[PDB]
Amino acid sequence: FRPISVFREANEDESGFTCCAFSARERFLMLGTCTGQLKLYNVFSGQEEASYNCHNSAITHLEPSRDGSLLLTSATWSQPLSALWGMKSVFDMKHSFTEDHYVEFSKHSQDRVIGTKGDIAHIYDIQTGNKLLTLFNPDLANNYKRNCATFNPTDDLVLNDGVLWDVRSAQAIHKFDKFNMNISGVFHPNGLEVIINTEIWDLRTFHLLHTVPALDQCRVVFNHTGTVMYGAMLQKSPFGSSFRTFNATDYKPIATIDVKRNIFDLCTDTKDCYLAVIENQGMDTVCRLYEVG
Ligand SMILES: NC(=O)C[C@H](NC(=O)c1c[nH]nc1-c1ccc(Cl)cc1F)c1ccc(F)c(Cl)c1
16 A cells, blocks of 8 residues: 555645545545535545535545445434435435434445434435335344444345344344444455454354454455455544455455554545545544555
8 A cells, every 4th residue: 555645624724534435437535524524626636626515513424326426424413414415517415314323325226225323224215215114123133332234235135233134025034143342244245244343154044154353343345346355443533543454255364554543434446546544644634545556
């Protein structure tokens, strides 16, 4: 990871970036701020191109749709906690998800949003904003403190609070047992495994496949080919001063990257040529751009 350059907030003594995503066509870097702004930076020039008032509290997380038309945001306090923005011609709010502190798009066909409110998952239609499903089974709850509900790659399944759901029947098919207080887990992009903190479970048989100690208290994101996994341990900054890369096929670590600055977020471009990391220089949180490669 070869550092290239830094994006900082123009017209501020201290930078206040909290999260990052590349635009679908990688023209711009979208940066959320601690004041609820979404700032667009030209990747080539480093220049701030727009600053949009999205929330009345710090933005925590962003997700652009693959087709470039939509953006999800989540914030910290107050209402709405999450929202869907149109990215075509005029930047505007399409819908709000008032109660949900985290939101993701569906994966295969991006026609749905999944939101999380504590132990509960909400699925919404993108066009209508209507709530299609509520997924919560009190007999299977793990009550994970940092629960984040997610679709699998085919959108047939959801993981919510370590419970596997069949979306089509809206029935719980399996509870993965609780071995940590915080992390609820994700689907591997390979479609075969679920990664819940340090445990790698077989999605089909539910048997334990691997123990991966380095993943304890980590959030993860994959490169776009699903060959490399990035993990950063939750701790103020959401993360510590390091992230680790892993071989996605065998969960063996590749590199340990200590930036010696607390991390707020990281993202890669669709081509995985670039890595952007929000790093505290101080709060003075800048976006450092790296060559991957
Ligand atoms: N943009 C992404 O998805 C990437 C992801 N970033 C977050 O999860 C992230 C950023 N701020 N806060 C959070 C956060 C923290 C806890 C939870 Cl429960 C849910 C969250 F969204 C991530 C993954 C691996 C990493 F190495 C790093 Cl540094 C970041």
